[PDB]
Amino acid sequence: GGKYRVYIDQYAKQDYFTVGYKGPNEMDAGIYYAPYVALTPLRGSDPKNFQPVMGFKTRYGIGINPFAESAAQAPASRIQSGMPSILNSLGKNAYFRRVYVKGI
Amino acid sequence: AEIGGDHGYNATNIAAGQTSGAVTQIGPAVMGMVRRAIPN
Amino acid sequence: AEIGGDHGYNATNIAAGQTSGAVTQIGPAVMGMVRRAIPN
Amino acid sequence: KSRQLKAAYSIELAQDLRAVHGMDADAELSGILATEIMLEINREVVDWINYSAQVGKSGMTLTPGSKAGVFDFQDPIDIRGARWAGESFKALLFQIDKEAVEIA
Amino acid sequence: KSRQLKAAYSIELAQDLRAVHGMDADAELSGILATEIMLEINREVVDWINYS
Amino acid sequence: LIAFDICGVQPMNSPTGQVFALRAVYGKDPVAAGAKEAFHPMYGPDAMFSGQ
Amino acid sequence: ASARGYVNIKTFEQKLDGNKKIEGKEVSVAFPLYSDVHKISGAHYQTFPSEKAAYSTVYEENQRTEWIAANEDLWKVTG
Amino acid sequence: ASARGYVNIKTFEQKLDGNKKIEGKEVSVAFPLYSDVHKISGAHYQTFPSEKAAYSTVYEENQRTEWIAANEDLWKVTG
Amino acid sequence: ASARGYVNIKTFEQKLDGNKKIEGKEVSVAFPLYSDVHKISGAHYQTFPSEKAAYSTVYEENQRTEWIAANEDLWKVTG
Amino acid sequence: ASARGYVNIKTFEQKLDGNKKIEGKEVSVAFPLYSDVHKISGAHYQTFPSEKAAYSTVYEENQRTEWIAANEDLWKVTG
Amino acid sequence: GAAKKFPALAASTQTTVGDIYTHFFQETGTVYLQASVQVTIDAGATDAAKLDAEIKKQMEAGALVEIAEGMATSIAELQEGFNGSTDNPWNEMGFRIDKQVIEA
Amino acid sequence: AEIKKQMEAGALVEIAEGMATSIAELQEGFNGSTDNPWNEMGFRIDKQVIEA
Structure with a gap:
């Protein structure tokens, strides 16, 4: 649309x-x-x-x-690791949203 | 052997400059500060 | 109130900038490095 | 965090690869190792984005009759009653805008 | 008779040490190695004088 | 490759950097359970805070 | 021991109404726990740092919600 | 727990001499403890970081000397 | 026989762990079979060419998967 | 004694194969005897000079062949 | 992967939360998956074709997700036995060269 | 104190010496030797903090 830069996940599962x-x-x-x-x-x-x-x-x-x-x-504990894990990034990041697509 | 070692992947350990090796660090540099935006 | 608060006068808390008050600090910077002389 | 790769080729292999095929049998490996490192790094970034991404088509980006996280082209709710490729494809574009909005 | 020492240091030590503190991680060690051998020899001579 | 135009960078000249973040908090307990944020993007202002 | 020191907190007993008051209390909170949460403001209190907990009742770092509840309790009104 | 993280130390069984062996051991040392004192050089080992102790045997911040001894014990010879 | 000769592989026993061993094995593999598939890298072994299989266990060219499985088994550890 | 000093030899026990070991051994050899003939190299060993034999088993110079056989025996593998 | 090996993801594998399991799909390639939910893969799925399908379903549901990671420097620094370490080899790669023929 | 008394007495005498060449030449596995590593040293870098 002249708006989103679309890239191909060449190895999508x-x-x-x-x-x-x-x-x-x-x-x-x-x-x-x-x-x-x-x-x-x-x-x-x-x-x-x-x-x-x-x-x-x-x-x-x-x-x-x-x-x-x-x-x-x-945040809890006020000094935190910024490194992603199951406790702080999985399914949580505001910047990205993933949708599966079926039926194509 | 002289080992650089590493941090503990824990922010307290990192912030304090603690390492698993020979050399204690100054601190984890500076990456600036992130501000919250104000609503329109 | 916007309390300054303090450290526990604990070296880790200080090195890491951890405080009991509103604001987390950066770090204690550098006063230089001390080395011994070689025996005569 | 670190990473690294080795090539470890023998003398005899290199002597014949050069004598028979014109290979350097050294420089090609430097090429191969550097290449694999770069390719893996790029992939790691993509994998983490998908990891940290939220389930989209969820929350306020849902149609009440939808399946939560997946857009199914054969499902009349997801494609909003659309027919043939000409209308059903457009329905996906609509869901993409909804996701983009929730990110804002 | 013989007298010898080893230092054995890593690359990562040298890379980070310099980036953070300005130190080399090789020069300090070559210094220490040579120094300890010389200091120990000098003592050996003094010790033999007191021994004898 | 996809390069890195899908992520940020924040490159390092020395290992192990750190980043701060500021939050505006109301209720006289800036550091506390229930200490609601004033400018959080998904929450409205506590309209009856300064008011009735 | 938290090994980060403690914040020692004293709540001073005060009268509120006929047969109503806020009971005085003496507690110690692991420094990182105090640092994580404190609802002590306007409470008629006094605090200080220490190497080791000053009082017999101590909230260690791994207690989190026991301490948060304790803070709400520093405002409790009784007989 | 260390409430920070651990250095997980794994040694591998080695033979020493006739009817003498070095028992392999798997331990977790609170990171600051490991940082303070260690002897892991020539231990026939692997290490890694973790949030929680990776092993059933753990030496916390306040154990100090249990760890120093445990470290030396990594080269202890048995049957 | 392959009538193209053989590649003879002998592995040697290793003390992988406490009461665990990787037994050495003697396998003769048809030259073109060995040539097609050989994971024998890091196998703790010795080799040589021969006209006839050197060992009592031989994998002929038309066996393909019997050999692949046998190859993988070279690192098998048992009590 | 040899009246010429000794060379002290220690061979560290090592495993060779399944149920096969090269036994650790400690011997002393008259210096001139050691100098004359020895087969110790590549053996997983340590040596040192001394004024007097360091070990209970000593090969005095007037042994020649008892010693040569004894040195070769450092390589013997048994149960 | 040069720091540690991972358990294979297979028929009726029960995955613990936070652990990484691996799988080679017969299409799209290698995946490293971090469990988010304690689940059992259901060995009704035996043949790889069914196993691949079930794994993808667990991925769709977010019970197991794509992950990639580097090596702690504390590991990388001593990779291949430095300072008494053991059983920690570098990974390595190179090339082959093969041929085909035709006849007139 | 007891050691010093014995030293004064001449019972225990302060001594140092280099190593046999025949040992040094094999140090850390040369020619099949074993369990004979070179002695080695390093350096550390520790720190202290204060407060106003």
Whole structure:
């Protein structure tokens, strides 16, 4: 409609769509992807048999937009992890709504 | 071996800068403050 | 009232910025780092 | 949070992959490992969005006779009495707007 | 006779240590390793003088 | 890939960051059970708070 | 021990009406519990920090709702 | 509980010597306790974080020395 | 016989856990079968080529799934 | 004594196969005897010099072949 | 997945709440699912075709949902036996090369 | 105190020495040796907090 950016979940398991809100800011999106270290190469060989060994390392971290739950006037314990889990994000985030679709 | 270690994935442990390794952290930096919007 | 409140004078509570009042704090920042000299 | 991958190829394999097929038999692996890491990361973000998303077509986005969380094109309530593709498809568009509104 | 020491430090320590405190995590250790060997030798000589 | 235009970023130059959030709360118990929020998006104002 | 210290709370007995009053009380609340909830404002009270609970009745961190109920009870009117 | 989280420590059974073995153990140590004191180097182990103790044996914040001993016991040799 | 020779795999016994062992196995696999499917990576083993199967247990080319199951069994742990 | 010092050898018991073990052993060898002939390398062992034999079983220099056999025996596997 | 293995999701699996179970669907691929409700999969569904269908139903109902996660740094740092750790290998990948022929 | 008396008495004498080469050369599994790791050291980084 000239309004929603539609992306294809190329690996969807059943059949659904998720509608979400995204603001202009890097800090207004419901969930955040926060990279720290990326694709650091590591190389060597094991002298035991001299076969070469190589690989890569990274570090990221993700989290919950404060107030994403939007179902409470206050948090418990006042200092909380913003990392998603069964207790704080599952089925709770105000920024996204998922609907399954059948009969197409 | 010298281990960096990590935090406990717990906000108290994190906020306090506690780690499972050798080095205690200053604190979990600053990501700003989120304000609540005012109704129209 | 908008009570300031206090810490428990507990190092964890202080390091983490946890208070008994209305507002959670950021952190105690940095006074520098102390190291020992090497014996002569 | 961290992640990482290894390739670990042998000398003999590389000697023949180059001699016979013109392969580097080193650089291709760097390509493969870096690629898989990037692909997985992108997927992790999508998986968490669907995880944290709320059940849509629920609460105030329901039609009283609906099934709560699923839009069924064969169900006259969900498609609002629509016929053929020409009208029933439009009914899905309507549910999408309702979801977008509840997010606001 | 011989005298030797090891440090063995991780990458993640070095990455975070620098990002937060400005320290290297290798230089401090190479310092300590070399230092402890020298301090211990100097004591060994003094100790043998008092022993003997 | 879907890239990251479906989420926010908040990138890090150092590990383990923290974010604060402010709430306007009424009833003289800003920190308490039942301490209702003044500007919550899904709730109306307690119209008879300042009134009758 | 909460190991975060305690908030020690004293409610001072006050008369309300003929044969009506709010009973005085002395309790200790784990710092993080107090930090989570307090309905003590306008209550005729006095508080202080400590390393260990000052009073025989203590609300430990894992009590949550026992403490919330206790706060409502600091306003209870009796004989 | 620790009311914060734990460092879950798992060791694997190792043989030591003729008719001597290192019993594998599975324990949960309150994070701040682990942070304060640990010896997990050369333990033939794996670790991970958790909200709740992953194991039936747990050393909380106020146990201190039960943990220090329990840690050393990770290399205890039995049958 | 495959008439293309064999790949001979021998695994060695491991003390995986307290009173649990992965027994070593001796399996001869038709060269083209081995070539098609071989999970024997991280198997704790030794190999060699041969004209005739080296071991009493042989998986011929037309057996396919008997071999795949046998392959997976190389890491089987029993009491 | 050898009057030339000793080399003290400790072999740490290890498992070889199902119900097969290479028994741990502690022996002392006259220094010149050790120097002359030994088959200990790759054995899961420790050695050290001393003024006097550290162990109850000692091979004095005038053993030659009793010793060589005794060293080879560090590799013997039994029940 | 390089930190821990997960139990398979299979016929009559009873899932506990908060645990991750895994499954390879015969279509759409690998899913990692976190239980939200204690449920039993019903081994009336035996053949993978029925099992896949039941798993999708549990997903539709929100009793079990898609999840992905990284590795704690405290784990990643010592992956592959660092500092006395054990049984914690890096995951690894590479390539093969095969062929087909025709005849005139 | 008792140890110091014995030291003064000359019964117990303060000593230090390096290690046999034949041990150092094998340190941490060289040539099939076992249970002989290098001695090692590190560093920590702790902290303290105050209040006004």
